[PDB]
Structure formats: C-alpha cells, structure tokens
Write a protein that binds this ligand. Structure first.
Ligand SMILES: Nc1ncnc2c1ncn2[C@@H]1O[C@H](COP(=O)(O)OP(=O)(O)OP(=O)(O)O)[C@@H](O)[C@H]1O
Ligand SMILES: Nc1ncnc2c1ncn2[C@@H]1O[C@H](COP(=O)(O)OP(=O)(O)OP(=O)(O)O)[C@@H](O)[C@H]1O
Ligand SMILES: Nc1ncnc2c1ncn2[C@@H]1O[C@H](COP(=O)(O)OP(=O)(O)OP(=O)(O)O)[C@@H](O)[C@H]1O
Ligand SMILES: Nc1ncnc2c1ncn2[C@@H]1O[C@H](COP(=O)(O)OP(=O)(O)OP(=O)(O)O)[C@@H](O)[C@H]1O
Ligand SMILES: Nc1ncnc2c1ncn2[C@@H]1O[C@H](COP(=O)(O)OP(=O)(O)O)[C@@H](O)[C@H]1O
Lengths: 217, 44, 425, 531
C-alpha cells in the first residue's frame, strides 16, 4: 500500500487494534501487563515519522522472574504466538553447549543472522523477530566466579554481550528470558540496552484466585 | 571432577580426494570436451 | 594529501558528552604524529604508536568512542572482530585466522612504503581469549597459541608501522602481561562515571533533535534534571529519555483498553512535559547509587530538635565537613560518636552525611555482611575501602563497630582478624 | 668464514649488555675460529643449542634480528612458533623435518668444509610444552617434540647446526630438551644497570642530537639518574612521549582548526620540561621500592632539639661500621619510645641518607588483607631477596602490629613471631652484609615475649617537653606572625608550664587552629587538654 497523507499506525500492526487484555487468558496479573505493554509494545505502533523525529530506539529486552509454577512460561508463550511477527527461535536451558572447541559460541552467533540480514536488506520495514531464552540462569553466571573450571562459563556470556549491543546496530529484535533466581545472572546483562524491563511475578491474591478459577473452568 | 573438549583434524583423506574432486573432474571434463568437439565435426 | 584527521575538526562534532580531558590525551599521544610533514618525523627518528586500550565499568561509553573513531577518520573500513570469534574447530585454524587480519596492511606496506593509508582493526572485548597464558583453562591449549600469535605479530621481527588496533574491556587485570609492554598497547585510558557538568552535557546531547523539532514543552529545566540524577551513568540517561517518551506517548493510543483513539489531532500536538520525567524517575534506578537509599532510609523517623545540644553537635559536624573540604594537607579525618544505647546515633551521623553534597558517600553496617563467611567479610570490607580512593572527596560511615567484630561478654569472644583489619585501615 | 673481517660491535644498536655478548661469543662461536684440525686433536665437540631468556622487553629480539647481518652468517631461517602446526595429518612433523635439508645436503656434499647454517626459533615455548600434559585428544602437540628431538639428538653426525631459541618463561619448556647435547648453554638477560641505561639513552638520541633537533639544555646524565627501573623499551617510549609534547605545541589538535606555523616547523626543539612531563606520563612495571620510604618521611624533619642530631649521628656511626668492617656481617637495632613521638620518620631518614644500593621497608600496610600463610611466604621471600646484594638495609615497622597483639586474651599469632625470631638472627651468605632497624612502641610486651636478646642496641626517643622546642616547631610551621608566636608562648608559660605531648599531635593542632581560629582560644585550648 501507500498512503499519501494520513498514514496508519502500522500497515501491518504487531498488536492490531482489535486487542484487549481479556483475550490472553492469563488471570490475576493486571498491572504487570500494563507496564509490560507500555514500555515495550508502545513504540512500534505510532507512525514512523513521529517516532523517527523522536529518535528513540525500541527496547530490546524483557526479563521475567519469580517463584516456581506461577505463570512465566505461559506469558512467554502467549506473547510468542498471538502477534504478527516471525516465528520464535526457541532454545531450552542448556541447549547451546556443543562438543568441539568452537561450537557453542558459534551456535549463539547463529541466532541473529536472519534478523541482521533482513534489517540490512530492508531497514525500518523489516518485520519483528523474537527469540526466547528459557531458564536463563543455567549458563550465564557471573564471570570470574567459582565453577565452570573449564573455560566456557566466560566465553558464552562474552559472545552474547558482544552480540546484543555492539559496534554494529540492530533494532528489529525482541529477546525475552525467564528465571527463578535473578541474583546469579551476570551484572553486565542487566543494564539499559540489554534486558531493560524486569518484572517480578508473585503469588496471587484472593481476587486473582477468583480470576484464575474463572479462567480455568 | 573436571571436564573435557575435543578437536578435529582433516587427514590426507581430503588432502587428496577433495583436491582430486577438482583435478579429476576438470580433466575427465577435458576428455568429454574433446569427445563433444569430435561429435560436432562428425555431425556436420 | 590524505591527512587522516580532516583539517577542520572539533570534539564538539563527535557527539560524546563529558570526557573532555581524555580526548586530549588520546589525540595527543596517538594521532599527534600522523598529520605532520614526513621529512620532519623522519628526522625525529621515531615510530608511530600502534596500541590503544579503553577500560572501565559497564555503560560508561567505551564502545561509542571506538565506533566514532572508526568512522570519522578518513581511513580504510575498520575490521571489527567480536570477542570469541577467532577460534575454530580444525587444529591450526584458530592461529591462522588471527594472522589473516594483518595480510593487507603488510601487502600495502611493502609496495607504497610510507604513503599507505591507515588500517584500523578493533578487538571487542579483549579479556575473553587473551588471558594470562599458563593456567589450565580448556585442556587443549589453544588460548596460549592465540596469545602467542598476537604477541609475535604486533611487534615480531618485521616492521609494519601503518596499523592501529583498538581494544575495550571491563576487567584489565586478566590481560596477559606481555601485551601491555610499551610497543604493544601503550596508551591505556580509564573511562569512569561522569560528574554533574558531564551529566548536563549528556542530557544536552541526547535531547537535541527533541528541542529543535519543537516537541519538548517549555517547562522542563535540564539543569534541574542534571541535579536530580546523582549517580546516573551515561547509559541510563538514554533510558530516562525513552521512558519519558513512553509516558508521554501512552496518553493517546491507550494500549489494551481500546484502540482507534490514534487520530491526527492527538498526535499533532505531542509534547513531553516535566511531569513525565518525574514519573520516569520511578522506573529507572541507578546501579551504583544503591547505598544512599539506605542512608536516607535510616532517618525515616524524622529529626526533631527537642533541645539545643542537637544544634551544637550538628554545627560541629558541619564545621568538620567544611574543614576537610577546604584543607589540603589534612587528607584524613576520623571521628567517633558514643553514648547510651537507643540515643539515636546512626540517624544523626547519616543526617550529617547527607547534607554534605560530596560526590561519594558509602555506609558499612552489619546489614550488608549478614550470612557471609569470614573471608567473604574481610574481602568485602577491603573492597569498599579501596573503592573510596577514586573521587576527590569521599565520606564513609561505619555502624555499630562492636557488632562488626562480633562481641559477646561471656567468653569474652570476638573475631580478632576483622578487628585488626579495621585498626589497620 | 664465521665472522666478517670488517666488524667491531661498536656500531650496533645493542648497548648496555656487553658481558653477555662476550660470554655468548666465547662459548658459542669460539670453537669455530681455528682450522678444524685442532679441534679433533683436542677431542672437543661443538655446541649445538642456545637459550636466551629474560623479562618481557629486554632486547632479545633485537639481538636475534641483527646477529645474522652482524657476523657474516648465512641468512638465518626465522620461524615463529604457532606456524609449524597445520591441519592435515603428518603436516606438522614433515614441516619440522623440512627445515634441515639444506644444511644436511651441504654436509653430505662437503664434509667439514660445509659452512654454518643458523636457524632461530622465535617463541620456543609455544609448541614445545611439556610432553606429558595429557588431555586425550589429537596428539600432534607431542609428536612435534619427538620429531625435533630425533633430528637434534639422533642427528647422524650433523655437527654444523646451531639452534637459538628465545622465550620469556623457561619453566614452560619441556624438560626433555634441557640436558647436555641439547640446549646446553642458557644465557639470562636481566634489567640494565645505570651505565648501560646511559648507553641506551645515547643510542636512542643519536639521530636527534645529530640533526640539531634537541635543545642543548637537555642533560642525559640527569635523565639516566631519574629512570630507576626503566628497560630499553620503556626508555624508547619515554623518548617518543617526550617528543609528542614538543610536537603538540605548533599543531593544536582538536581545539581550533589545523593551524600549522610553517616557521616554527624549522625551529622545533625539545626541552627538559617536556621530558619531565613524559616521566610523569610513563611508569615502570617493576618498582619494588624507593618510593614507600620517601613518602614515609613526607612531613620532613625540623631539628627542634639536639636529641634528633645525636640519634642521627649514632645512626651514621652504625652505617659506617657495617660499611667498613668485614667481620661484622650483621647488625640489628631497636628504636623504642612513647607512641606518636615519631619513630618511623627517623629510621626512614637514616636509611635514605645511607645511600646503600639496597633498601626496603616492611609495614603492616603492605601485608593487609592476606591470609597467614601468604604473610609468612611474603616475609620469607622479602628476606631471601635481601640476601642478594653486597650491602643491604632493612626496616621493620610496628612489630607489635605485625604479630597481632591484643591484650585481652592476650591473643597473638605465634607462628609469625617465632619466624621473625629465627630470621632476625640469621647471618647472610658469605661476603654479604645486612643492617636491620626495627621500631616499636610497646617495650614491655616485647620484654614479656623475652625476645629482647637478639637486639644489639636499643635507642630511646623521648618526646619533647620544653616550650622552646614548641616555639621552634611553631616558627617553622609559620602558624602566625611574630607577635602571635610570642604571645601564645608567654600565655602557655603560666597556663601549664609542665608539658608532655609528642610531635604529631602538635602539627595536627596547629593545622586545626589555623583553620578555625588561629587566636589563642583554639590552639592553646587544645594543647592544654592534650597534655
Ligand atoms: N495466572 C495464571 N492464569 C492461568 N493459568 C495459570 C496462571 N499461572 C499459572 N497457570 C497455569 O499453570 C500452568 C503451568 O505454569 P507455567 O508454565 O507458567 O510454569 P512456570 O511458571 O514456568 O514454572 P517454573 O518456574 O517451574 O518453570 C499453565 O499451563 C497454566 O495452566
Ligand atoms: N558519555 C556519553 N556520551 C554519549 N552517549 C553516551 C554516553 N554514555 C552513554 N551514552 C549512550 O548510551 C549508550 C552507551 O552504551 P555503550 O555502547 O557505551 O555500552 P558500554 O558502555 O560500552 O557497555 P560495556 O562497556 O559494558 O560493554 C550508547 O547508546 C551511547 O550513545
Ligand atoms: N535529636 C535527635 N537525636 C536522636 N534521634 C532523633 C533525634 N530527632 C529525631 N530522632 C529520631 O530518633 C530515632 C533514632 O533511632 P536510632 O535507630 O538512630 O537509635 P540508635 O541508638 O542509633 O539505635 P540502636 O539502639 O540500635 O543503637 C529516629 O527515629 C530519629 O528520627
Ligand atoms: N625530629 C623529628 N622526629 C620525629 N618526627 C619528626 C621530626 N621532625 C619532623 N617530624 C615529623 O613528625 C612526624 C612523625 O610521625 P610518625 O608517623 O613517625 O609517628 P609514629 O609515632 O611513628 O606514629 P605511630 O604512633 O603510628 O607509631 C612526621 O610527619 C615527621 O615528618
Ligand atoms: N639495549 C636495549 N635493550 C632493550 N631494548 C632496546 C635496546 N635497544 C633498543 N631497544 C628497544 O627495545 C625493543 C626491544 O624489545 P624486544 O627485545 O622485542 O622485547 P622482547 O623481550 O619482548 O623481545 C625495541 O623496540 C628496541 O628498539
């Protein structure tokens, strides 16, 4: 299409204005959804002109942490498969480690090629990409700590740092991670520009329990 | 309580066969080109 | 004919706020030999430096600089390499790859002599592969060989004299020693958090096109904001701007509740107000300014001047603060508050501390150490004291010394090592 | 033949390492000077292996580079370590035994007439690591050692080959190659002395001085004096860094545009202050000492009384004694007195005036944060180091604190104490001398330790008491005007004639009174409470 004047929020919207929070199927959590959807999926709806005059790059990180069995993976899934974007490249926890001297870090490098290719080829009209790290807290531990006597516990974290924010830019990705212990993740991963919005998910209050019961039955 | 890596080495196997998969294609190729040239003359 | 640094050039056009004193050194030591008549420098019989290291804590802007130096200097396209990208499976492909970077510089240097153009290669994140050779890291022995190859190629037995290498890291103490010798990575620069003026500069830079496109309200006062954001680093101001934008922009579309509200009238008068920023201060929080929250929390109960001795003690404290600020030979002053328990000592000490306005304020209490082992405690304490030798003016507060050394009268029992550490320190 | 007839070694870049040059020449190429007939007549075999090593940046590569052109040698074959290895099976081994063909062919061809072929392995330690490393993987990292070892030990009578291997760390080398017949001779290259330092400066500044590009003001001797622990590389870095300052006065980088004063280009000239700035820029990486003692006496002396003079004279006497006699190879002294009277400064001052080659201090400051074993090891290494130079002065600070004394137990670390007890009585190795000064403030505690018997002589340092000395320190500190300094002492005479403070507290009080109210009401007030 082409609109001479009075262009749309998005010719192919990611959220698509026929959307409301009662369609997800996640009961209870309500403010969390508000904060998440505002901080992240607000800058990808307005016309490109105003956003470009504003010069703010979209947030490229999301972290969810909380006790076991609370709903984290549910949220990740619904976000993954209720949007208008390319299919997620799921990776489980220690799915990355490989046998030979140089295969784990190559595997990490493998995840970004389609995004860089399309961004290079097209630019701002590239469709969004999503990749989900499951159970982030397995491999990406604080550098220089005890454990990982083998020299892998550093190189892996290193490649990921260099690749999410480096000398070459990229702003058509959204990465999400889930965990039970955020106190062990490396400190350099939790700065603005890498995993910006962090959300705790807690046990439900009573009214939330009523909501969950109504959702299930 | 420790852990190990592994490595690869390419072995004459390829030092020969893969280089031969250039020389021995282009050269038999040379025989086939000769055949084609002769057939062209014969057909004429 | 091809003088790299472009005859008219100003630091103002780089686009980096703060750090006005570093660029001077870098350009004086590095590029101050390459924009001069060749005959003179030849008479001078010296060789251009070929190394550069930039180190500091995360988010201080040590990757922006490398990029701009790469792009603004009228040289060949920079050869980027990410950290652990060199290694390879087959034996002998790792070492070969690191000597494939130098081929073209040498290729030019044999032919055109001293008229070749600068070549620049940027190693991102040096410390991952170039650790101190000698340990038992992998069980194969590749890293030593890579360090070796780099050692032999940076200086070696052959001269290149037309190359430059740039490096970035967060931990400088693991780099193998031989790299740091002069002749390899000569100039080394620390990039630290900004001061207030640097903060103001950064705010000015970030919200530039903001202002000239008439999308900023006239209410915001950047000086006030720079005054509010005390321990913010360079990489969290940008977060602040983004968040303020999100608050301002959310007022129209109303994501989730109902769409279609996006219409020309609403979006034709977008303007970020001051309230948006204040709201955004509740989302972004420092990472290094985590101790001042404790101090402000310690005086939550509030100060009430039930008498006048309170005034006198406070004035004496302010006097002492002034004295340390104004003196030059008195580089160390220590004080003690004692009195009956429950008399409100910690609140008063913190209350004095917060008005000082010093750049650096920190507190040690039994709170931070709880659950730790002895060695862990001693390490933490030593770390905190060594961190206090950076800024020009510093304030440190110790709470309940008796409980830190773990005193109980029954034995008497107490830990001697921590006591000695404190006495020495 | 083996050395060019036209050569004298004066022309070469290498300077400051002359003894090492003579040792190498004597033990390496000496046997290849005469006609061959003599050597067999004497039944002496030739040397085959050489090793050079030292700390990073000492000049070994310079030697390895220039020797080929230096001695009419066949163009030496240079191979850096990690290039011998290769991907394909058997490639590394053949690569190693691909170097020796030319020499061996010449050997079969021409017997003993064959010329000398020299090959140098830069970076010996990279590949020839220990051949018992383990790892359960591709064994190319071992058979290379076997290949070189076979071609170097089972040579089959090749007697015209010298391999020179350079490294920075001998320890990593496989021990199998350090044995007779295989890298017999090992030459250490250590940091330069002062005279070689001057040689290096001169060599570096040759081209500068020739082209009249240096101001006559500059004095090399002063610079050589200043650079305590600088190697050649650091000296070169200093030279070019000093140059950058002179360069950066015409070209104003960043500020303004490019403003090149074409006239001053011809008047470019370096000056002393530029070198001083450069010294502030570069720093050495060795350090050891000669700074802690200087900072320990920063406050300086005042000679407020004769006692200072007498003590200093006694110290001078003792240093003379240890300097002169050969039967007195060890002397120990104690300095004890009231706390805060000022002990450390005095000992540091005496040591500084002594001017011996070798000096250090041990203080609780350095040892802070370490575990007990680490502290023991540290002290032991420091002592072992002290037993090296011909003359040595060692200072020990606040002994009681080193032993972790607290009077409530009384608790203390016995191991450190007894280690010190044995160590302070150890005569150094033959024909070495040592002088120990230890300071303390808790004489009685030491007496209970019964460790008072290893001290040859004890020195008291009474704190000052007479108002005159107070006037001396006050006039030196320039606290006030003349009338002020008079009135205060007149007031103090009657306010409190009996007087006992010390020294440190006095300076502290002076500064505080200066800050707030240099009238009597502060300085005299505090002085009165303290006493
Ligand atoms: N808020 C919720 N609303 C509805 N169902 C929920 C909610 N929270 C959890 N559930 C239910 O719990 C199931 C399992 O939850 P989930 O997949 O989030 O586990 P998890 O939180 O990832 O646990 P873990 O930490 O062990 O990985 C979901 O399939 C869903 O049926
Ligand atoms: N002083 C500054 N001047 C200009 N921009 C800055 C400054 N500090 C931060 N920024 C901006 O914020 C971001 C800083 O991220 P940067 O690329 O420096 O990561 P980093 O600090 O190098 O992280 P790390 O050192 O941990 O790898 C960039 O977008 C940069 O433009
Ligand atoms: N002039 C004052 N002096 C002391 N406390 C005051 C004064 N004015 C108000 N306060 C309040 O008194 C309380 C002081 O309690 P605080 O915990 O400091 O006592 P403390 O003796 O330090 O504690 P502890 O008994 O554990 O040593 C705070 O609530 C503080 O706000
Ligand atoms: N004649 C002198 N004797 C001693 N100190 C002097 C003299 N003249 C000047 N000073 C100054 O007096 C100070 C002595 O302090 P010093 O640190 O030696 O005290 P100390 O008693 O060793 O300390 P501590 O009580 O911790 O053992 C130094 O600043 C020194 O410069
Ligand atoms: N006599 C000398 N001693 C040490 N370094 C010197 C001397 N003369 C010159 N140099 C300079 O020092 C460097 C030599 O260092 P090099 O031997 O390569 O260090 P490494 O020990 O790492 O091989 C060269 O840049 C050279 O110009």
């Amino acid at each position: 299409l082409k609109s001479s004047n009075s262009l749309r929020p998005r010719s192919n919207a990611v959220i698509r204005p026929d959307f409301k929070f009662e369609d997800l199927g996640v009961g209870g959590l309500d403010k969390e959804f508000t904060k998440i959807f505002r901080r992240a999926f607000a800058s990808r709806i307005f016309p490109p002109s105003v956003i470009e005059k504003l010069g703010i790059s979209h947030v490229k990180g999301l972290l969810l942490y909380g006790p076991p069995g609370t709903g984290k993976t549910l949220i990740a899934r619904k976000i993954g498969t209720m949007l208008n974007a390319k299919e997620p490249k799921i990776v489980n926890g220690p799915e990355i480690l490989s046998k030979y001297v140089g295969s784990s870090e190559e595997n990490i490098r493998n995840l970004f090629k389609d995004a860089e290719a399309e961004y290079r080829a097209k630019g701002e009209e590239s469709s969004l990409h999503i990749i989900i790290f499951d159970e982030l807290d397995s491999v990406f531990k604080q550098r220089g700590s005890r454990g990982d006597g083998t020299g892998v516990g550093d190189n892996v974290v290193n490649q990921l740092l260099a690749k999410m924010d480096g000398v070459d830019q990229l702003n058509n990705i959204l990465v999400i991670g889930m965990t039970n212990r955020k106190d062990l993740i490396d400190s350099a991963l939790l700065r603005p520009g890498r995993f910006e919005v962090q959300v705790e998910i807690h046990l439900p209050d009573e009214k939330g329990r009523l909501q969950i019961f109504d959702i299930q039955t | 309580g420790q852990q190990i890596f592994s490595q690869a080495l390419l072995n004459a196997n390829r030092r020969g066969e893969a280089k031969t998969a250039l020389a021995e294609v282009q050269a038999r190729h040379q025989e086939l080109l000769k055949l084609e040239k002769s057939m062209a003359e014969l057909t004429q | 004919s091809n003088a790299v640094i472009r005859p008219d050039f100003k630091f103002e056009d780089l686009g980096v706020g703060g750090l006005d004193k570093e660029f001077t050194k870098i350009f004086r030591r590095a590029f101050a030999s390459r924009i001069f008549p060749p005959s003179v420098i030849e008479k001078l019989g010296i060789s251009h430096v070929k190394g550069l290291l930039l180190y500091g804590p995360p988010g201080t802007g040590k990757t922006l600089i490398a990029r701009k130096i790469g792009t603004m200097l009228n040289a060949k396209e920079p050869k980027i390499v990410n950290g652990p990208e060199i290694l390879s499976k087959y034996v002998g492909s790792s070492e070969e790859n690191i000597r494939n970077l130098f081929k073209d510089a040498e290729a030019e240097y044999r032919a055109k002599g001293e008229e070749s153009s600068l070549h620049i290669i940027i190693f991102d994140e040096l410390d991952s592969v170039f650790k101190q050779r000698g340990s038992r890291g992998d069980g194969t022995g590749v890293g030593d060989n890579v360090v070796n190859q780099l050692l032999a190629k940076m200086d070696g037995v052959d001269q290149l004299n037309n190359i430059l290498v740039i490096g970035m890291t967060n931990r400088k103490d693991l780099i193998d020693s031989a790299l740091l010798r002069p002749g390899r990575f000569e100039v080394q620069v620390e990039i630290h958090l900004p001061d207030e003026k640097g903060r103001l500069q950064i705010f000015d830079i970030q919200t530039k096109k903001m202002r000239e496109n008439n999308m900023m309200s006239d209410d915001v006062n950047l000086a006030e904001l720079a005054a509010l954001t005390k321990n913010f680093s360079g990489a969290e101001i940008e977060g602040l701007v983004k968040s303020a934008s999100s608050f301002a922009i959310n007022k129209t579309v109303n994501i989730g509740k109902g769409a279609t509200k996006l219409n020309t009238k609403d979006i034709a008068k977008l303007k970020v107000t001051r309230e948006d920023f204040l709201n955004a201060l509740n989302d972004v929080t420092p990472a290094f300014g985590i101790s001042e929250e404790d101090l402000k929390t310690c005086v939550e109960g509030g100060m009430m001047l039930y008498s006048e001795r309170v005034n006198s003690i406070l004035k004496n404290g302010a006097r002492y603060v002034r004295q340390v600020r104004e003196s030059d030979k008195s580089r160390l002053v220590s004080l003690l508050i004692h009195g009956p328990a429950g008399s409100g000592k910690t609140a008063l000490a913190a209350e004095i501390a917060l008005k000082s306005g010093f750049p650096f304020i920190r507190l040690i209490s039994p709170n931070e150490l709880s659950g730790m082992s002895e060695s862990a405690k001693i390490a933490y304490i030593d770390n905190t004291f060594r961190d206090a030798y950076k800024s020009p003016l510093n304030i440190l507060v110790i709470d309940s010394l008796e409980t830190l050394v773990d005193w109980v009268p029954i034995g008497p029992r107490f830990s001697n090592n921590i006591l000695q550490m404190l006495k020495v320190a | 033949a083996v050395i060019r007839p036209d050569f004298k070694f004066e022309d070469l870049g290498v300077g400051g390492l002359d003894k090492e040059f003579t040792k190498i020449f004597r033990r390496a190429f000496a046997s290849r000077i005469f006609p061959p007939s003599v050597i067999e007549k004497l039944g002496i075999s030739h040397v085959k292996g050489l090793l050079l090593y030292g700390p990073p940046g000492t000049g070994k590569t310079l030697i390895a580079r220039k020797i080929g052109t230096m001695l009419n040698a066949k163009e030496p074959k240079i191979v850096n370590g990690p290039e011998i290895l290769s991907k394909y099976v058997g490639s590394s081994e053949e690569n190693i035994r691909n170097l020796f063909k030319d020499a061996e062919a010449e050997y079969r061809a021409k017997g003993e007439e064959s010329s000398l072929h020299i090959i140098i392995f830069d970076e010996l330690d990279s590949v020839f690591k220990q051949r018992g490393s383990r790892g359960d993987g591709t064994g190319v990292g071992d058979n290379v050692v076997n290949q070189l070892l076979a071609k170097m030990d089972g040579v089959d009578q090749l007697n015209n080959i010298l391999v020179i291997g350079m490294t920075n760390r001998k320890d990593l080398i496989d021990s199998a190659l350090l044995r007779p017949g295989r890298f017999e001779v090992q030459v250490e290259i250590h940091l330069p002395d002062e005279k070689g330092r001057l040689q290096i400066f001169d060599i570096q500044t040759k081209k500068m001085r020739e082209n009249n590009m240096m101001s006559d003001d500059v004095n090399l001797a002063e610079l050589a004096a200043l650079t305590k622990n600088f190697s050649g590389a650091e000296i070169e870095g200093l030279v070019k860094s000093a140059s950058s300052f002179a360069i950066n006065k015409t070209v104003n980088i960043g500020k303004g545009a490019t403003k090149l004063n074409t006239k001053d280009i011809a008047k470019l000239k370096v000056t002393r202050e530029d070198f001083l700035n450069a010294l502030n820029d570069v720093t050495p990486a060795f350090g050891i000492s000669e700074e802690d003692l200087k900072t320990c006496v920063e406050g300086g002396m005042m000679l407020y009384s004769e006692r200072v003079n007498s003590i200093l004279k006694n110290g001078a006497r003792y240093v003379r004694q240890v300097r002169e006699s050969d039967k007195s190879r060890l002397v120990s002294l104690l300095i004890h007195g009231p706390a805060g009277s000022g002990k450390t400064a005095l000992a540091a001052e005496i040591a500084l005036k002594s001017g011996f080659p070798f000096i250090r201090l041990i203080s609780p400051n350095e040892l802070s944060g370490m575990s007990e074993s680490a502290k023991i090891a540290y002290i032991d290494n420091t002592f072992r180091d002290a037993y090296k130079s011909p003359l040595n002065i060692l200072v020990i600070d606040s002994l009681e604190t080193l032993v972790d004394w607290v009077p409530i137990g009384p608790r203390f670390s016995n191991n450190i104490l007894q280690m010190l007890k044995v160590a302070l009585k150890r005569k150094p190795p033959q024909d070495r001398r040592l002088l120990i000064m230890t300071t303390t403030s808790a004489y009685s505690v030491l007496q209970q330790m019964d460790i008072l018997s290893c001290f040859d002589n004890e020195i008291a340092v009474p704190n000052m008491t007479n108002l005159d000395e107070l006037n001396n320190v006050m006039i030196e500190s320039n606290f006030l005007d003349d009338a002020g300094r008079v009135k205060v002492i007149n007031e103090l005479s009657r306010s409190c004639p009996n007087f006992n403070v010390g020294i440190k507290k006095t300076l502290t009080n002076i500064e505080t009174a200066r800050h707030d109210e240099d009238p009597v009401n502060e300085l005299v007030e505090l002085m009165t409470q303290s006493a």
